[PDB]
Amino acid sequence: CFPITLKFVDVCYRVKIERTILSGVTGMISPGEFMAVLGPSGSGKSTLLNAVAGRLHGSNLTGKILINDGKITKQTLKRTGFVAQDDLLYPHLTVRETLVFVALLRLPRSLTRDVKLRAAESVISELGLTKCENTVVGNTFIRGISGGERKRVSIAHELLINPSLLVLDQPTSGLDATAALRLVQTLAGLAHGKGKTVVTSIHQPSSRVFQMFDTVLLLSEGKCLFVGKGRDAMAYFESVGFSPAFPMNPADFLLDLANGVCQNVRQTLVTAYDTLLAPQVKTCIEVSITTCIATWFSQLCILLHRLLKERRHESFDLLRIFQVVAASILCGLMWWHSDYRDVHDRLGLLFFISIFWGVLPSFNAVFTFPQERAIFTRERASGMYTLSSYFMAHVLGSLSMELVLPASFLTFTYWMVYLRPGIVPFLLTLSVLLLYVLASQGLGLALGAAIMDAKKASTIVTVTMLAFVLTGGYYVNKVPSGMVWMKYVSTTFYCYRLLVAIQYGSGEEILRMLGCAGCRFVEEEVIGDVGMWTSVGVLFLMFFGYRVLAYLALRRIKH
Amino acid sequence: CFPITLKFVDVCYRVKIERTILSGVTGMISPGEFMAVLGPSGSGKSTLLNAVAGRLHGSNLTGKILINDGKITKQTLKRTGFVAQDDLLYPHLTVRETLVFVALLRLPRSLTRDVKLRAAESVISELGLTKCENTVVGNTFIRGISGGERKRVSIAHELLINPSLLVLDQPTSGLDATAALRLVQTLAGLAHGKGKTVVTSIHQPSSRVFQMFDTVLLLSEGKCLFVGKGRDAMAYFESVGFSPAFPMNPADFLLDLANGVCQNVRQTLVTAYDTLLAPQVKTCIEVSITTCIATWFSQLCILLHRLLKERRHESFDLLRIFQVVAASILCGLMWWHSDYRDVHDRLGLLFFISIFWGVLPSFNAVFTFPQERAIFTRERASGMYTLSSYFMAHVLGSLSMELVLPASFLTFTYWMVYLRPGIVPFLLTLSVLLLYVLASQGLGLALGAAIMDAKKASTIVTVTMLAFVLTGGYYVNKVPSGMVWMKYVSTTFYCYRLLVAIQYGSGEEILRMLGCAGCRFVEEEVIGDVGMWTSVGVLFLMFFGYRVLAYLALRRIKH
Numbered sequence A, B: 001c002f003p004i005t006l007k008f009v010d011v012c013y014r015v016k017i018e019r020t021i022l023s024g025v026t027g028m029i030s031p032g033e034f035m036a037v038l039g040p041s042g043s044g045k046s047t048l049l050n051a052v053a054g055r056l057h058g059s060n061l062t063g064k065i066l067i068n069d070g071k072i073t074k075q076t077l078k079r080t081g082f083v084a085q086d087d088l089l090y091p092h093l094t095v096r097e098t099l100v101f102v103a104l105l106r107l108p109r110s111l112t113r114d115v116k117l118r119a120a121e122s123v124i125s126e127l128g129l130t131k132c133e134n135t136v137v138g139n140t141f142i143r144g145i146s147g148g149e150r151k152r153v154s155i156a157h158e159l160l161i162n163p164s165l166l167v168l169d170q171p172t173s174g175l176d177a178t179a180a181l182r183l184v185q186t187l188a189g190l191a192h193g194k195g196k197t198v199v200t201s202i203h204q205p206s207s208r209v210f211q212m213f214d215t216v217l218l219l220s221e222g223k224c225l226f227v228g229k230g231r232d233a234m235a236y237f238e239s240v241g242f243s244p245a246f247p248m249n250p251a252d253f254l255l256d257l258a259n260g261v262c263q264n265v266r267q268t269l270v271t272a273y274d275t276l277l278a279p280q281v282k283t284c285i286e287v288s289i290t291t292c293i294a295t296w297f298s299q300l301c302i303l304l305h306r307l308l309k310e311r312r313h314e315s316f317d318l319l320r321i322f323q324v325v326a327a328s329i330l331c332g333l334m335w336w337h338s339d340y341r342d343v344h345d346r347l348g349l350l351f352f353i354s355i356f357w358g359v360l361p362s363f364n365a366v367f368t369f370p371q372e373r374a375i376f377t378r379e380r381a382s383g384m385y386t387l388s389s390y391f392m393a394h395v396l397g398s399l400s401m402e403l404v405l406p407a408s409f410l411t412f413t414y415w416m417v418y419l420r421p422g423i424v425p426f427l428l429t430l431s432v433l434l435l436y437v438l439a440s441q442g443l444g445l446a447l448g449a450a451i452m453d454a455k456k457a458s459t460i461v462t463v464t465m466l467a468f469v470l471t472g473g474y475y476v477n478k479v480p481s482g483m484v485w486m487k488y489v490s491t492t493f494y495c496y497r498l499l500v501a502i503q504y505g506s507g508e509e510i511l512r513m514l515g516c517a518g519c520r521f522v523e524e525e526v527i528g529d530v531g532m533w534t535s536v537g538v539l540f541l542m543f544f545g546y547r548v549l550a551y552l553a554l555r556r557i558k559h
């Protein structure tokens, strides 16, 4: 156990459209207590819950928000559960597969599997989800579960973390009259039977749901009108002058007073709060090893299989492989019947392969992290997993299909053109082309993680790659000697220098075959200047270096 | 007036996970009548409302859904308003700007402006939106209006069309107890004061909201338990054997019977419905000029200014122009001090400009229609605007920034390299490069409209453009004569042939300057074979032809 006492004193919040959203909201909620935050629409009660959760800060917010007499630490955000108002889930897992991945990641690890699975399916039977558990969670384009079943998957998503402070933002909207009573009876058993601290906002409770709250907060356009016990609310407003004509729901009467339609009703109740109850609240706020490298790897295995079955359907594209294959038959027919002695044509084949496999991996990889932006952000604030195992699961998860496409391109082009016979110069050509595809993929990952949308990022990578083609070593013969150093930054340069070295070597065979346009051209472009091992040792430095800079760009995003 | 009588007889709906969602739902709602669809979560009442709206069809749905004794026609979907459960709005318009664009497009056109604007702001004062009207509607990443204010913008969005059948899917979820009473009192004034047909589903009504419905439908796992007047519901279930112990809300008692927790309750009430009330429902279902080209243009002007102020902020990028400018200084320095007589180097400059400005417009344009997919789909089913004025507003809206980038690229490169002096060969080079940018943009628009997401589509366009580079006319000298026809499909071919013709002409000056590698190379590649006017007349055929095929690919999407 780790009991949280929450305090918030004089919380204000301005925004620039200057509009005051919250102004002077003081309260305190203890462990063992279930509090409701009532109010009209726009009164500010999802800005107040979003500041005591720790997801709203800056120079707009002003006021002391205290969790056990201290600031909001990184330690206290691991014991806090926050169920937001909009639901962000994966559109391809089923309801049971969604709630097993949460149970394996977040439950105490010194606990056997098949007990973590009998915790995930005793939550399904408490929320009534045992009819749609084999149904896929959908989105706007994939039709799946209901809106009231999607709401209860998100509450189960936080009820499997076992929090110490549970903050919910309208959990009963979209639920009928019987499912909303049972959910409030569940949350009242956490507060009264386990000693937790539950804060919730709620819109249309019945007279039976309203009798289960220990404490009511009533907002009205950013200023509170009542803080105290729910069984004192109707007897407070009678002593100020307001009472219902016909007997009715007490939660219907308190929302007429907050709208001011209970027959200056609002401004009477604001200054009557600041002289009768507001001083006595701030008087009450004065006193009241090898088991560590197994948790990294098991988080990696869960995050792999979760992303392999996102791409199971909507993917396994034969369309990507039947188009790269037709482009390799197309290149192999343009250079059908070219000869080994024609050096000027063979170096234009080898430079087009460098253009093709620098442009194609790099432009595809710019979609990887921007297409995860809303769900990565939400799960980073929860504390689900570390970043170095989320990152490494996307490195290893892309690497299968990214290596089948260059290997099937080159099997057609190498033997139709009939470049150089032997199994040894074929496999060296295959492995240089697979090291260049991985170094070109990491350029697109780093620019998609720094710029977090794909339309803005796939403009920066198109101009950057066309500048690597220009300084890559084919287009200009004399460069101004003061711009010769720019080719040592280009990835395209080090691949094209390695493919020419496998085919023609260090001269010395074409120079005896071409005799010695025949012996002048083959001394600037065939002989070369960068060694064969330093062109390999720099494509490894761009392999690791472009994935380090993609990790540091994702490290920024925090809340 | 055009009164709609809605009927639906024996509606079934199966889905393949075989699961029966709806089975045998018979009802009839007349004009002047306000009907509520009650039920638990997952009982199927948003599948039933989504089939009588006309947005759900196929081989799964089976049953006669009739609107004035006929099928769902294209004419009846113009008089129908459907407020869905999730809200899809533009994240950059304010609340007032959202509701003025709807009033100008959808109100009767033979009606003066400043009366269409006093219709848009008398709806704001009926829904209580007169505090957030100057606040921007947000999204998940832009913080804007509330969730209960977003719900009422969507109801106002359909209350400005003046429908004849209004179908709403949970309109009071996210609203407090006083705003939910006023909204039901608004919808009851449309049905009883104007003679419309309102169908709504609703979750937790109070005892005062429940007394405003004329007709109740009660579902329970896809089978109806009661159809009839709301003031006969409690007296019906008493005569079968069910009655509340303590006096309570009648809408709370009917949801206990549908969940079966009212103390085989459900299966008793299903077979008691099919012998007592279900035969008497189907007995009742037996009887009961130049003003046309001004509406095209005013829809074009509203759709332009709506999309120009979506790109006002999040855009006006100096980042796109400061990077294209640096790439033009970079090209102009690589070919600084190259001479006019060196023909083999100048034709490698001119081919790199063809690569740069075919790849850059085409890859950016693949995001245009896929980033509008959810909102284009919703407004296409409403009948907001025609497609040929939505399409033409995106042609004219992109064309400003797409022509400033090639014109500022070429001002640096043409005079640093110092290609050919004269203002006349400069402007011919500028206009050929602007005709090729528009023809390359239309290739990306057609592949983004046919494939309706941008990650799948920006793989098809990368391999297609690298195949236009290969057959574009630089890489291979002898092609197998049986593949010479493929260059006449490439866009890159016709630009590169036009830039060589402006610089060197029809030979006849370099041949006297180079005397006659000097007179052999300049006869395959400088002389050329395609005329100067047929290279212009084919880039106009690919200009119009690639925007026709993008219109026909958007014509598919309908509901």
Ligand SMILES: Nc1ncnc2c1ncn2[C@@H]1O[C@H](COP(=O)(O)OP(=O)(O)OP(=O)(O)O)[C@@H](O)[C@H]1O
Residues within 6 Å of the ligand: A132, A135, A143, A144, A145, A146, A147, A148, A149, A174, B015, B016, B017, B019, B021, B039, B040, B041, B042, B043, B044, B045, B046, B047, B048
């Ligand atoms: N494409 C689908 N595949 C499988 N099941 C589906 C599909 N679409 C809907 N369902 C199921 O149909 C049932 C009814 O769904 P629907 O959304 O129509 O009910 P609802 O009454 O609107 O629920 P709520 O009140 O929670 O919004 C749900 O149990 C849902 O799981």
Ligand SMILES: Nc1ncnc2c1ncn2[C@@H]1O[C@H](COP(=O)(O)OP(=O)(O)OP(=O)(O)O)[C@@H](O)[C@H]1O
Residues within 6 Å of the ligand: A015, A016, A017, A021, A039, A040, A041, A042, A043, A044, A045, A046, A047, A048, B132, B135, B143, B144, B145, B146, B147, B148, B149, B174
């Ligand atoms: N970034 C912002 N800029 C301008 N106004 C804002 C911003 N954020 C919130 N508001 C305004 O603050 C008011 C309160 O918003 P909030 O969402 O906190 O209220 P709420 O009680 O949760 O409403 P609901 O009950 O409808 O969900 C709203 O009127 C909203 O328009």
Ligand SMILES: [Mg+2]
Residues within 6 Å of the ligand: A145, A146, A147, A148, B046, B085
């Ligand atoms: Mg639903």
Ligand SMILES: [Mg+2]
Residues within 6 Å of the ligand: A046, A085, B146, B147, B148
């Ligand atoms: Mg809100």
